[PDB]
Amino acid sequence: VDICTAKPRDIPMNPMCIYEATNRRVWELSKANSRFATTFYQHLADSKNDNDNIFLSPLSISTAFAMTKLGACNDTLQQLMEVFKFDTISEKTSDQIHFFFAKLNCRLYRKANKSSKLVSANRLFGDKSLTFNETYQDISELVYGAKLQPLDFKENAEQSRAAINKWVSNKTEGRITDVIPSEAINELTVLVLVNTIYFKGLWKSKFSPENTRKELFYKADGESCSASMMYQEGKFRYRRVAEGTQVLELPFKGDDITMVLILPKPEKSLAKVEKELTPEVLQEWLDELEEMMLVVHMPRFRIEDGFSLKEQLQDMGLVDLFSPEKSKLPGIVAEGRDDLYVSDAFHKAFLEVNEEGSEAAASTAVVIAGRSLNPNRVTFKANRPFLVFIREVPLNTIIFMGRVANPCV
Amino acid sequence: VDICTAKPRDIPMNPMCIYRSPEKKPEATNRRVWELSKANSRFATTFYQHLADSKNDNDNIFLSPLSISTAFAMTKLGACNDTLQQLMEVFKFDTISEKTSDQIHFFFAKLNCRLYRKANKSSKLVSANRLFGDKSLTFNETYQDISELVYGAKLQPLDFKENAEQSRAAINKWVSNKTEGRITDVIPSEAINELTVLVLVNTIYFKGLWKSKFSPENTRKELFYKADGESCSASMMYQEGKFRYRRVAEGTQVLELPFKGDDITMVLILPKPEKSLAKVEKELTPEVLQEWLDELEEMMLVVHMPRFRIEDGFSLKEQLQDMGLVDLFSPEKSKLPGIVAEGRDDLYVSDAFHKAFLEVNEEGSEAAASTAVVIAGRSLNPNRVTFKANRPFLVFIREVPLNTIIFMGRVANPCV
Amino acid sequence: SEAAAS
Ligand SMILES: CC(=O)N[C@@H]1[C@@H](O)[C@H](O)[C@@H](CO)O[C@@H]1O
Ligand SMILES: CC(=O)N[C@@H]1[C@@H](O)[C@H](O)[C@@H](CO)O[C@@H]1O
Ligand SMILES: CC(=O)N[C@@H]1[C@@H](O)[C@H](O)[C@@H](CO)O[C@@H]1O
Ligand SMILES: CC(=O)N[C@@H]1[C@@H](O)[C@H](O)[C@@H](CO)O[C@H]1O
Numbered sequence A: 001v002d003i004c005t006a007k008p009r010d011i012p013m014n015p016m017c018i019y020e021a022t023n024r025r026v027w028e029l030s031k032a033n034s035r036f037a038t039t040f041y042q043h044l045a046d047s048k049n050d051n052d053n054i055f056l057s058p059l060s061i062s063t064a065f066a067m068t069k070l071g072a073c074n075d076t077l078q079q080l081m082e083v084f085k086f087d088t089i090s091e092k093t094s095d096q097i098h099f100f101f102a103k104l105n106c107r108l109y110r111k112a113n114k115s116s117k118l119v120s121a122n123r124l125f126g127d128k129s130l131t132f133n134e135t136y137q138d139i140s141e142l143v144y145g146a147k148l149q150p151l152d153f154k155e156n157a158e159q160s161r162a163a164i165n166k167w168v169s170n171k172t173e174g175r176i177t178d179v180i181p182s183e184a185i186n187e188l189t190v191l192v193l194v195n196t197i198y199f200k201g202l203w204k205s206k207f208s209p210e211n212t213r214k215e216l217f218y219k220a221d222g223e224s225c226s227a228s229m230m231y232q233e234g235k236f237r238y239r240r241v242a243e244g245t246q247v248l249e250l251p252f253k254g255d256d257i258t259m260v261l262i263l264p265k266p267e268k269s270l271a272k273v274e275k276e277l278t279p280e281v282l283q284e285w286l287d288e289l290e291e292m293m294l295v296v297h298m299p300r301f302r303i304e305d306g307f308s309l310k311e312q313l314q315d316m317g318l319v320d321l322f323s324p325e326k327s328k329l330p331g332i333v334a335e336g337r338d339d340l341y342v343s344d345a346f347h348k349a350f351l352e353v354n355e356e357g358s359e360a361a362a363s364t365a366v367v368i369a370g371r372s373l374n375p376n377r378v379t380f381k382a383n384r385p386f387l388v389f390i391r392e393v394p395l396n397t398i399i400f401m402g403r404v405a406n407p408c409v
Numbered sequence B: 001v002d003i004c005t006a007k008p009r010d011i012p013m014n015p016m017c018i019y020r021s022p023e024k025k026p027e028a029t030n031r032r033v034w035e036l037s038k039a040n041s042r043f044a045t046t047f048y049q050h051l052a053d054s055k056n057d058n059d060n061i062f063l064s065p066l067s068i069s070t071a072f073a074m075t076k077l078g079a080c081n082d083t084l085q086q087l088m089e090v091f092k093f094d095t096i097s098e099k100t101s102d103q104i105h106f107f108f109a110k111l112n113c114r115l116y117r118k119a120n121k122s123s124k125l126v127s128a129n130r131l132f133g134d135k136s137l138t139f140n141e142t143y144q145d146i147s148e149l150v151y152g153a154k155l156q157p158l159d160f161k162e163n164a165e166q167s168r169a170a171i172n173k174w175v176s177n178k179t180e181g182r183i184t185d186v187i188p189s190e191a192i193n194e195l196t197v198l199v200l201v202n203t204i205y206f207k208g209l210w211k212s213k214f215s216p217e218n219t220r221k222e223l224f225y226k227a228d229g230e231s232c233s234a235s236m237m238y239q240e241g242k243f244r245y246r247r248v249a250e251g252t253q254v255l256e257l258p259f260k261g262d263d264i265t266m267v268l269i270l271p272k273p274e275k276s277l278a279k280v281e282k283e284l285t286p287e288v289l290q291e292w293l294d295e296l297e298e299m300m301l302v303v304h305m306p307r308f309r310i311e312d313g314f315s316l317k318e319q320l321q322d323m324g325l326v327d328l329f330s331p332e333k334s335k336l337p338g339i340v341a342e343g344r345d346d347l348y349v350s351d352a353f354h355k356a357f358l359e360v361n362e363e364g365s366e367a368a369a370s371t372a373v374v375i376a377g378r379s380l381n382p383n384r385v386t387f388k389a390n391r392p393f394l395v396f397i398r399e400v401p402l403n404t405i406i407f408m409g410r411v412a413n414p415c416v
Numbered sequence C: 001s002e003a004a005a006s
């Protein structure tokens, strides 16, 4: 059975608890994903210094929590529906959302042209001594291509953590190497749900390295660092808007996946734009872009971001799922454990931009019954940041999003 | 025999007369054309100082020294005696030590070859010379030939005796054409009559695009402070980037803005708000200007420069005369025997007119705006040097490899 | 910049 081709009934969804048409459904989900994206980004932004970098794949995070939702129940299940906005999809049963998410993934990673590389790989890691519910296992593999791999958490938390991080590294051409922090997984860890996404496109209009020059970049509080600024001249869908904010779209070969840069007018702060960000605000801009001859200056760079998702998500609505008391994930383990709750969830993203094109990768790991690690951190605030989006146009999906502030690498 | 690749021996000048320039007191280019470039500039600077001095501080000024040097160098071909000498002195051709007046022309052809390379370049720099003589007169064969061989000037016969006006309309049409319509009615109605036998004309036309773009989106209205102590609204172009710059004497700022191709650029001289431009002009010596140019160093700065159109026209007779060119204009003293054959050897220049045009803006086009600029990930030094041209300043458009001043002027009022 | 002279 191939879900991509299959129809609603052809796939026996048997979720334990509960709370063109396939195309308009998929779309509505893309909107739901977008909603979660900009909202999560704002919360994430409030936890960081306006001059720090921020990179993440909302899609990855949405996928890992959808996967997790397959065993959710009660409020836990409901809260999951609302926090990720799946509850805005014209449906009735919380279980139907999964079918369309599969449809989306299908269109996102399965195409003939493949002008640009965009792959995804999901997987589950359960303790070698437990008996996992068979429906949950079979449905996760079917809907999300996520097989359940055995791991000895009880006797080898570390072996396992390294094992998972390595599996992630393999699916991210080695750009994501430590999604899971050192002590995040312990003897009580029951399961770790993981998502990975890897992208690599070529500029439809590449830059000449001959036109790339070094340029002193001044960090807000401090001195400078050399930066490689690329230079190109040509026609691009562009648009200067309110308060002098510029919106520039850089399409990759194929035009199905593009990179949108957003920058405030010089001396005007970016924080104001972020606080007004919204799927519609963004759509508004995207609709106002016009073909125009322009000169584009843009740095050659790479940024890496990593963090816990627990904090942000709780503030957004996900409370139960992380509570050892209120969490309700009955549909996962059939026999072996019964008090399942998410101890933490980590994400890690990578973005590199050069003359040939761009490369991005991400991963989300939802750790069940592990040790809740205290929020990590790596501050190096820079200056004058611009927003970035790597989206798939036909599917209206924000694959990656972020704020580039330190073009010094 | 192509003059651009010819050896001096392949081009016989057979001049009617000769003058020996008295005894005096790099970079992979030709020694002689380099010296001629220096000469043209000495004339350029000097003549500009004179012209500006006779002009009110609130007036814009614009002209082409190269155009003038070329025309008179063309006229020198038939000059003799004191007319020949003065020509060599005023236009500083005599400062190319121990070189004879006829050798100047060979060097001038070589300079023109480089200048109007016409190669697969980006900026357009063209030139056109032409002699308009009366159909009834019989011009010197050597004069005719050399004017063509060295300066590419053909001899088109006109009927000044019967149809002077029709002849004037012909000349004007030619110049308008050679200047993409920017230079019209060069020759005044009054001028050109039944006694007119020769009208020598040189045209220079240039159009380039900025190598560093001035996005129209960033242009805004700002006050310009004229010499009369008043202000006016100007269109200010704005950008930040690296340009060859240098802070010289008494806080005067010198900035070079290159056009696509790097071969030609625009140099601006902006005195500190305190110092009046008249002073900088009075001190702008040929050797001083040269020092400044050599001191330019690439540097990150902010540029504030207005859009503007300048149209200047004037007679060169008076200025040139105060500078030493007298005989040429004297019906009694002029010596131009090498131009018209058989008699009429007491031929003199009745008048000499210059007309120049200059437009500066973002895209180079007078149309609306169709371009923009996006600079992502830039954070410059908060203490970067700033160049704000909201007061009178000097302007030059030069050919760097040769160090030739093609045009020059003063922007005393860019307002509308 | 566009300039011409005669
Ligand atoms: C094996 C087990 O624990 N029993 C339940 C079963 O009652 C339910 O029908 C199914 C649907 O998700 O989930 C589990 O299999
Ligand atoms: C000016 C010129 O063409 N040169 C010749 C000159 O060599 C010769 O001596 C003279 C007749 O005596 O005829 C011309 O002037
Ligand atoms: C002052 C004058 O008119 N006489 C001389 C003439 O004798 C001489 O042959 C000629 C050659 O250049 O130079 C002048 O014309
Ligand atoms: C809070 C709780 O455990 N009670 C309900 C239970 O009454 C119901 O039969 C079951 C079916 O999904 O869902 C549970 O959430």
Ligand SMILES: CC(=O)N[C@@H]1[C@@H](O)[C@H](O)[C@@H](CO)O[C@H]1O
Binding pocket: B176, B177, B178, B180, B181
């Ligand atoms: C290029 C342009 O538009 N300028 C025209 C040219 O097309 C025409 O050939 C010429 C007369 O021959 O007159 C010029 O003014």
Ligand SMILES: CC(=O)N[C@@H]1[C@@H](O)[C@H](O)[C@@H](CO)O[C@H]1O
Binding pocket: B014, B015, B016, B139, B140, B141, B142, B143, B338, B340, B341, B342
């Ligand atoms: C046609 C004529 O008048 N003859 C003279 C000739 O004697 C002189 O040698 C030559 C050099 O310029 O110029 C010619 O015009």
